[model samples]
Target: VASAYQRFEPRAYLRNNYAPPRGDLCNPNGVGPWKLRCLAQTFATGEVSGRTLIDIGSGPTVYQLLSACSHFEDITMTDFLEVNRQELGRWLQEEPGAFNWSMYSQHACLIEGKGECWQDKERQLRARVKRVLPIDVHQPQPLGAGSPAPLPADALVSAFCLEAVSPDLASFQRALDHITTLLRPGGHLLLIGALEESWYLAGEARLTVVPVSEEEVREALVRSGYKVRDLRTYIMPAHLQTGVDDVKGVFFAWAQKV
Candidate 1:
C-alpha cells in the first residue's frame, strides 16, 4: 500500500486530531479519560503530590504535563524533536484565555464522575507548566547527554512516546535504561504506550513509527535497575473524528528506581 502516513507529523496530528484523548474513545463508564487512567493506574498506591515528573516525548501538547501539574509540585516535559519541544514551549507561555476552557471543563466533569472532580481540582496544573530540559533517547551522555540542567526532578513520565523511532527491541531496552537513569534511586517513573504500533500525523509531511511493546518495556525496566510495581492496559473507543474502533492502548506502568 502507499505510505498512508507520509503526510503526518507526530505533534500536529496529535494537536489537531488527538491531543491525548481524555474521553469516551475508551471505556464507556471510565472516568477522567486517558490522563486519569494513565496517571492513576501507574501510581495506584499513592498520590501525585510532592513528586517531580519528567515527560519524555511530550509531543506538541501538554495534556499529561497539565495533568501531572494538577497534582505534583514539579513537572518536566521533554522530547527528541525540536518542533515538538517548541510547540510545548509556546503552550507553556500561552495565557489561560487561549486554552479551550470549555472543553477542559467538560473533561474535568467526567473526571468527577469517577469519584472527585479532577478537572477544576487544581488550577496550578495550568500555571506551573515548565520547560525544564531537552532529552534525546538515542544520545549517550549525562543530563541531556551529560549536562544535567540546573533542575533535578524526583520522577519521570511519558505517554505513547518512547516506542516510536526505536530501531528494535534492544534499542527500546537501551532507551528505557537511559530514561530510568535520569531518575534517582527510589524515584518514580510513569510511562504509557500503544499496544501494537502506529504512525502519528504531525505536519509538513513526515510519518514516524517505532516498535514499542508492553513486554519489552517490562523486561527493560527490570534490566535497567527499576522495580516494576504495576503494569496495566487501557482500551478506548474510536476517535471522535476517525470512527475507527481500535483506539485501545497500554495505559500505565509505575516503577521505582532500584
Candidate 2:
C-alpha cells in the first residue's frame, strides 16, 4: 500500500460513485445509505447542540452533516485536498455541476423527524456551513499554514479520515490527538470509521486504509484524553458487498474531551 491516497479524485467520487444510482451505490438498501442513516440517527439522538462544530477531513460528501446542521449554528468543514474542497464548494455555492444531495438530505430528514420538510432541512444545512477550510492532519495545527488561530470548536465530527490518511496505527493515534486540538475542553468528538477496512476504491483510486478493531478504536480515544460517551456498530449486509474493499463493518463513537 502507498503512503497516501494521492490519486483520489473528489469529483469522480461524487459524480460517478457514491451519490444515488450513478454506480448503484448509496441507494436505500446500500452500505452508503445505511452508514449515512446511522450517522444521522446518532446525531439526532446525541448531545449535538453546540455553538460551533467542525467536520474534519470532509470529502465531497455532505450526507454526514445533514442532521448535525440542525444543532449547530456555525459549521466548518475541512479537506486536505484542493479538489475535494472545490467539490464541496460547488454544492455550497450552488454551482452548475454540484452533485445532487437531495436524496441524502431527505433520508437524513426522515431520521431527524422532519420527513415532510426535507427541503427545509437541506436549506438549513447550506446556511449553517460557514467555511470550507484546508486541513493537513500531519500538521501541528491541522487547519494548514498561514491561517489565523481558530477558535476552539464546541464539537467535531470526523468520518473515514484518520484511518484512511494515516500510514499506521501510531500515526492514526497521532492524527486523533491532532484533531482533538481543535476542540474545547469537554467538547464532543463524533467519529465514524471502518472497522476492518484495508482499502477502498474511490473513482479510479484504490486508497490504503489502516485496518482497526473496535477495541483499538476505543483504546485510541481513551489514550487521546477522551472519555467514551456512546458507541454504535453496523455490520455490512451481505447483499451490498461489491468486493470494492474488505470492509467488514462500520463503527460510530461519541467521545468527550476530558
Candidate 3:
C-alpha cells in the first residue's frame, strides 16, 4: 500500500486542478508574468539547448518534459510515487486515439527520454526513457544510510512543486540539498512554487501551507551548491476584492553548481 502522497498522480492533478475559469494565463505555458520571462531567461542563458534535464519530482503529465524536449535533446522524468509513473505512462499509451502518444511522436524528436507511458503506443518512444529511480529527495536519512547515488544530469527543473509537502523551511532546504546533490557541476536548476500559499484545493487533499519567500529560496540554493545567475519575481493579476493579487508570484532562479 502506498502513502497518500505517494499514491497521488501528476496527470490527474493537472487535468483536474489546473482548470482555469477563463482558460489558462500565467506561467509561459499558461499565463503569468514570471512564466514567460523566466522561460526566456532560461533560453537566453544558453543552457537549456542540448542539455540533459532531470525533473526531480516529475508528475504524470508530459507538458514540461515535452516543452523542454522542444528546447533540449534529453529529459528524464521521475517521481517519489509509483502511482504517478504508472498513470503518466498509461495516459501516454492508452488514452483514446492515443493522443499523448501522437503528440509525443510529432514533437518526440524534441525529447530524448520517454517514460513507460509511451510503451506499446510508440515502441521507439518507450525505449527512450533510460532509467527510473524511486528515491525520495526530501529524505535526509539517505546520506548516512548510503543509498544509491542520486540521478546525475546536466540540469534539473522542479516546477509547481517542492513546497507543498515540505513541513517547514528547514525541510525545504533539505529538499534543495538533495536536488543539488543529484546534479553534476555547473548543472542548471529551476524551481517554481507559490509564495503566498493558502489552503487551496489539490484533488481532495487540503495541503497545509509552508510558503517560502523568494529571498529564502535564493539562500537555500546558495547554501545547497549553486550561485544565482538570474532571479525574477512576478505577481499574478488581481483575482479578489480590492483588486489585490496578494503575493502570488513565481520565482525563476537560474543557478549553476559551483
Question: Highest TM-score: which candidate?
Answer: 2
Model 1: residue 220 alpha-carbon error in angstroms = 1.8
Question: Distance (Å) between predicted and true CA of 203, model 1?
Answer: 3.5
**Would you list the clashing residue pairs of candidate 2?**
none
Models sorted by lDDT, best on top:
2, 1, 3
Question: TM-score for model 3?
Answer: 0.71
Candidate 2 Cα deviation (angstroms), residue 129 = 0.9
Q: Can you give the lDDT of residue 54 in candidate 3?
A: 72
Q: What TM-score does candidate 1 reach?
A: 0.74
* Cα lDDT computed for each candidate against the true fold: 0.58, 0.80, 0.56
Could you give candidate 3's per-residue lDDT for residues 185-221 as a string of tens digits? 8777877666766434335544554677889888988
Residues 1-258, model 1: lDDT tens digits: 014333435555554444344333344434236555456444444543455666787766555554456556566667665656666555555544233333444555454344545445435654555444666776654245354432345777787666665646777777787777777667878777766555544566544455456776788788888888778765544344342222335557877777
Better of 1 and 3 by TM-score: 1
